[PDB]
Amino acid sequence: LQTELYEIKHQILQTMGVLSLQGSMLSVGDKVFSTNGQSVNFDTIKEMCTRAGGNIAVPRTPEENEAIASIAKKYNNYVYLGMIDDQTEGDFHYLDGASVSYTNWYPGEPNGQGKEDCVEMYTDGTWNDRGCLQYRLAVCEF
Amino acid sequence: LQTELYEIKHQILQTMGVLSLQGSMLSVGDKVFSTNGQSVNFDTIKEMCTRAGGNIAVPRTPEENEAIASIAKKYNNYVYLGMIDDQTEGDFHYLDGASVSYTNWYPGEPNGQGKEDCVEMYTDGTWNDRGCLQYRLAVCEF
Amino acid sequence: LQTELYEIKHQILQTMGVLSLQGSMLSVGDKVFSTNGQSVNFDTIKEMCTRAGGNIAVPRTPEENEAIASIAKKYNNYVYLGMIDDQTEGDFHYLDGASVSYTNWYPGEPNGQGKEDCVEMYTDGTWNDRGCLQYRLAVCEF
Numbered sequence: 001l002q003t004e005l006y007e008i009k010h011q012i013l014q015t016m017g018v019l020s021l022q023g024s025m026l027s028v029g030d031k032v033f034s035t036n037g038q039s040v041n042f043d044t045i046k047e048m049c050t051r052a053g054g055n056i057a058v059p060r061t062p063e064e065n066e067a068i069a070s071i072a073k074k075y076n077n078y079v080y081l082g083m084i085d086d087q088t089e090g091d092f093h094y095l096d097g098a099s100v101s102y103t104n105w106y107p108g109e110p111n112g113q114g115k116e117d118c119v120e121m122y123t124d125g126t127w128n129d130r131g132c133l134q135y136r137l138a139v140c141e142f
Numbered sequence: 143l144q145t146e147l148y149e150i151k152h153q154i155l156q157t158m159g160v161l162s163l164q165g166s167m168l169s170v171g172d173k174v175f176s177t178n179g180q181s182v183n184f185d186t187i188k189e190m191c192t193r194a195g196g197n198i199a200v201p202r203t204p205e206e207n208e209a210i211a212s213i214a215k216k217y218n219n220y221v222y223l224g225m226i227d228d229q230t231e232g233d234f235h236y237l238d239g240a241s242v243s244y245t246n247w248y249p250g251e252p253n254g255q256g257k258e259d260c261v262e263m264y265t266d267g268t269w270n271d272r273g274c275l276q277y278r279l280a281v282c283e284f
Numbered sequence: 285l286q287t288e289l290y291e292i293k294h295q296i297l298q299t300m301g302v303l304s305l306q307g308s309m310l311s312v313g314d315k316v317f318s319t320n321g322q323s324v325n326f327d328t329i330k331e332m333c334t335r336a337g338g339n340i341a342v343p344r345t346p347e348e349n350e351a352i353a354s355i356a357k358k359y360n361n362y363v364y365l366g367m368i369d370d371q372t373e374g375d376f377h378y379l380d381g382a383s384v385s386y387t388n389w390y391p392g393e394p395n396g397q398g399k400e401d402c403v404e405m406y407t408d409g410t411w412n413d414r415g416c417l418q419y420r421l422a423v424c425e426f
């Protein structure tokens with residue numbers, strides 16, 4: 001079976017290598033990020049990522065933030081991130097319900113104070129709280 | 143080894159997630175469908191799919207039919223399916239030799255009665271028996 | 285676990301099938317070749333392939349040569365290969381340090397005699413020793 005396992009691991013590396021060369025994914029630690037280049041609103045990005053078997057991307061580390069920012073830069077668009085401050089204002093949570101730890105707010109942000117429940121990322125990787133109805137680059141994590 | 147197996151399964155899911163996000167595959171049950179968007183005749187589609195390690199797509203379930211129809215719709219072209227009524231007329235078989243079960247004939251079809259040995263799918267997912275020399279969207283199953 | 289292993293192997297085959305259909309990879313024996321279609325110099329191709337988890341492509345067999353030549357033909361560009369004759373002139377080595385075995389020099393080549401330390405492949409698959417600063421099609425192996 002060890003023959004099978006080595007071969008399997010090698011083939012997985014080949015396919016991920018191919019996708020990484022084609023610019024179709026970025027691997028960061030345990031996470032893989034990807035975009036198909038389309039721009040839609042926050043709710044539609046969630047459905048899109050979920051349909052593909054993943055989730056709207058969120059950076060929980062400086063390294064993850066840089067990877068998503070590099071995607072925002074390459075595709076030159078603002079990006080919606082997987083966090084919201086719905087139920088309680090000023091209190092941003094990941095979509096799994098956990099309170100946000102790492103942040104990278106653009107100076108002055110977040111300033112919505114009720115009416116801005118989503119978070120967008122600028123091309124320099126910094127964050128702004130925003131309404132959820134804008135068209136933003138869809139980035140998913142797997 | 144359980145560490146290896148969990149990691150392997152996760153990486154497989156990441157790559158399939160990426161391909162699904164990019165619109166490069168559709169997963170239905172055990173089957174994966176894909177097209178590269180090219181149009182060729184029936185014999186050439188078979189060679190193309192076989193070269194890639196798969197087979198010309200055929201729907202054996204309503205669910206599979208819908209998936210292929212969604213590809214025909216997205217690419218806006220008629221699609222050749224993996225069935226033929228060669229040796230016996232009115233008797234359509236899969237390419238593995240088995241008699242066809244599920245069908246979705248457009249009203250009046252099949253009407254070839256000798257001279258139409260292939261099957262094409264319209265953009266609404268319904269079927270027509272047809273000659274095999276037309277240029278149709280190549281869709282493969284894996 | 286056998287259920288897991290069969291399923292894993294099948295899913296790997298599906299993803300590789302998809303990538304092969306999309307024209308995003310060529311499998312030869314143990315090797316997988318891929319290009320993203322970009323043209324850069326020798327040093328930049330190495331970095332690009334390494335970033336993706338692979339290496340600049342080199343043919344060690346007639347079969348591997350044909351696969352890379354088919355990529356050079358499809359993309360209609362000269363290709364840099366993973367071999368150099370740096371430290372000793374007339375003495376080409378793979379990037380792992382081993383002396384080159386299989387060759388396919390265009391008639392008259394190699395003729396650099398000091399000043400041509402890289403190797404390019406023409407669209408017909410034959411080789412020429414060349415300087416390393418030209419823009420060539422980036423082809424990686426995994």
Ligand SMILES: OC[C@H]1O[C@H](O)[C@@H](O)[C@@H](O)[C@@H]1O
Pocket residue numbers: 109111116128129130131
């Ligand atoms: O000045 C920046 C400011 O501009 C707009 O009002 C909105 O996008 C706010 O979310 C943002 O904080």
Ligand SMILES: OC[C@H]1O[C@H](O)[C@@H](O)[C@@H](O)[C@@H]1O
Pocket residue numbers: 251253258270271272273
């Ligand atoms: O009326 C539809 C009819 O049109 C043509 O004659 C052919 O494509 C037939 O296969 C099809 O049944």
Ligand SMILES: OC[C@H]1O[C@H](O)[C@@H](O)[C@@H](O)[C@@H]1O
Pocket residue numbers: 393395400412413414415
């Ligand atoms: O005649 C072919 C000859 O042309 C140029 O001088 C260079 O590309 C050489 O590397 C090559 O050998």
Ligand SMILES: [Ca+2]
Pocket residue numbers: 085086114115116117
């Ligand atoms: Ca609110």
Ligand SMILES: [Ca+2]
Pocket residue numbers: 085089090112113114115116117118129
């Ligand atoms: Ca708010």
Ligand SMILES: [Ca+2]
Pocket residue numbers: 109110111112116128129130
């Ligand atoms: Ca704001």
Ligand SMILES: [Ca+2]
Pocket residue numbers: 227228256257258259
């Ligand atoms: Ca006939």
Ligand SMILES: [Ca+2]
Pocket residue numbers: 227231232254255256257258259260271
């Ligand atoms: Ca017939």
Ligand SMILES: [Ca+2]
Pocket residue numbers: 251252253254258270271272
């Ligand atoms: Ca007919």
Ligand SMILES: [Ca+2]
Pocket residue numbers: 369370398399400401
């Ligand atoms: Ca030299």
Ligand SMILES: [Ca+2]
Pocket residue numbers: 369373374396397398399400401402413
């Ligand atoms: Ca030389």
Ligand SMILES: [Ca+2]
Pocket residue numbers: 393394395396400412413414
């Ligand atoms: Ca030369």
Ligand SMILES: [Cl-]
Pocket residue numbers: 130131132133134
């Ligand atoms: Cl809004």
Ligand SMILES: [Cl-]
Pocket residue numbers: 272273274275276
């Ligand atoms: Cl015909």
Ligand SMILES: [Cl-]
Pocket residue numbers: 414415416417418
């Ligand atoms: Cl040069």
